[PDB]
């Protein structure tokens, strides 16, 4: 098994911001990592390309992955409408942790958040599966478009994405 | 995230005693710390200003926060009548610890207590969410107006309160 | 006590359709019933007057109550952001049953649904608290604007609402 790396090219209102690469911990949570990988390559016919980060709260996290409703109520996994929480081995240890958003136990679809702080209150409720490899500064740049309620001031989109390793 | 700091200007029978500031551990218990923060700013139209410490047991704790009934039977949170115990990450490790009072599991409202001792028998039953940053001497001053049964001899009031950090 | 009756006056875009009255089972679920009653009078400063039915699925139910986001993601109770499932005494026994919508256990706010069929697969998961007294024919008329996906074809609104009994 070798942990895959995927990239996201972020755009703010169409203008390029930069690339963020992610190492996916397939050595710990392989089903959750293959879901995010396949959705970044879009190999199964649908994926993250073109979707937006609908909720950004500075100093907490950036949430995205809802490619069907673009507002937090949609998304779907490559395994179907929802899939179980694989395990909770990994913890939300600091900035750049990539973890699954959900609506209670076993409702993982395609939404994720990138933590810009340590969020230990979420341990045991959200499956951690990746970490920003390069591009943390780009995630901090994204932060500047959020607010305490999550509203973005510009449309932050995943212009392109795919797998590197 | 940055942990907020709030202050309480305490008064005894009107005559001003001093200021206590508290760091609220938003990195561990964000919902509990936000409830305390917002009830100290008054931004929801209700809060701690003008309420009194109704139970002080020297060498144990000063309990306050009942702003609706002023006697231990009331208070409310910014989330409703009561809210869930957020988590029990922190322990009552010594003096200056700030913790939620309750009437059994998941009954948190606005009542809290400032420990003047380590109270480890309360661990796991009361949510710890803050610590005295500066002003311990004002809490030690407050102790002196309480008794083994908790009755105060003088009206210990939160004259003012708000946020700093 | 005596079981209160509330009424909703339904509008389709602008045109008045008719009034539906509901008996609320305060003898079984007093806290859930009082929540709906107070939101129908609007006595706490907010309530159902003017909100719409955002999801109607013909032969199943009409879902409303989201007066803050108007799309299924909001609503709030008179007791706060959410409240406990009171009990599951009553069953979804047939058309005209009024039950609480939720997002899993203990997430009752203000959203509800009026069953137009017997929905017993929901028993034990949604708190039943009322029954259509007069006006079932108006709920029948509302049905006609839905679709398999819940999308309404007209803006179905609660033009007026209040208590009768």
């Amino acid at each position: 098994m070798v942990n895959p790396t995927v990239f996201f090219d972020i755009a703010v209102d169409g203008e390029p911001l930069g690339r963020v690469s992610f190492e996916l911990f397939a050595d710990k949570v392989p089903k959750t990592a293959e879901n995010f990988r396949a959705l970044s390559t879009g190999e199964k016919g649908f994926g993250y390309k073109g979707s937006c980060f609908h909720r950004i709260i500075p100093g907490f996290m950036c949430q995205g992955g809802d490619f069907t409703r673009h507002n937090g109520t949609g998304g779907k996994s490559i395994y179907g409408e929802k899939f179980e929480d694989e395990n909770f081995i990994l913890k939300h240890t600091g900035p750049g942790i990539l973890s699954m958003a959900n609506a209670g136990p076993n409702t993982n679809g395609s939404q994720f958040f990138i933590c810009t702080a340590k969020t230990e209150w979420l341990d045991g409720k959200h499956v951690v599966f990746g970490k920003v490899k390069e591009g943390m500064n780009i995630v901090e740049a994204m932060e500047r478009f959020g607010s305490r309620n999550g509203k973005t001031s510009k449309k932050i989109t995943i212009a392109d994405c795919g797998q590197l390793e | 995230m940055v942990n907020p700091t709030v202050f309480f200007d305490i008064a005894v029978d009107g005559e001003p005693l001093g200021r206590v500031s508290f760091e609220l551990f938003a990195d561990k218990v964000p919902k509990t710390a936000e409830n305390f923060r917002a009830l100290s700013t008054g931004e929801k139209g209700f809060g701690y200003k003008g309420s009194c410490f109704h139970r002080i047991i020297p060498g144990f704790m000063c309990q306050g926060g009942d702003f609706t009934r002023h006697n231990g039977t009331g208070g409310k949170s910014i989330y409703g009548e009561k809210f869930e115990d957020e988590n029990f990450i922190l322990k009552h490790t010594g003096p200056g610890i700030l913790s939620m009072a309750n009437a059994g599991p998941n009954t948190n409202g606005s009542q809290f207590f400032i420990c003047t001792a380590k109270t480890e028998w309360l661990d796991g039953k009361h949510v710890v969410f803050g610590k005295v940053k500066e002003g311990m001497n004002i809490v030690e001053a407050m102790e002196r107006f309480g008794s083994r049964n908790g009755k105060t001899s003088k009206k210990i009031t939160i004259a003012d309160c708000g946020q700093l950090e | 006590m005596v079981n209160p009756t509330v009424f909703f006056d339904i509008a389709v875009d602008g045109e008045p359709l008719g009034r539906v009255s509901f008996e609320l089972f305060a003898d079984k679920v007093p806290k859930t019933a009082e929540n709906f009653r107070a939101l129908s009078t609007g006595e706490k400063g907010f309530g159902y007057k003017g909100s719409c039915f955002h999801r109607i699925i013909p032969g199943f139910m009409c879902q409303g109550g989201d007066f803050t986001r108007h799309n299924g993601t909001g609503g709030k109770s008179i007791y706060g952001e959410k409240f406990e499932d009171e009990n599951f005494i009553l069953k979804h026994t047939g058309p005209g049953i009024l039950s609480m919508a939720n997002a899993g256990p203990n997430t009752n706010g203000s959203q509800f649904f009026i069953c137009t069929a017997k929905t017993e697969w929901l028993d034990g998961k949604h708190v039943v608290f009322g029954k259509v007294k007069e006006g079932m024919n108006i709920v029948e008329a509302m049905e006609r604007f839905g679709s398999r996906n819940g999308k309404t074809s007209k803006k179905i609104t609660i033009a007026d609402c209040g208590q009768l009994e």
Binding site: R55, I57, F60, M61, Q63, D66, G72, T73, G75, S99, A101, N102, A103, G104, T107, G109, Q111, F113, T119, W121, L122, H126, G150 | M1, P30, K31, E34, I78, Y79, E86 | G72, T73, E81, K82, A103, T107, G109
Partner: peptide, 11 residues
């Protein structure tokens, strides 16, 4: 409060 949910976002 500070949660990351999909649909009923709470405080």
């Amino acid at each position: 409060x500070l949660l990351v949910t999909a649909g009923l976002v709470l405080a």
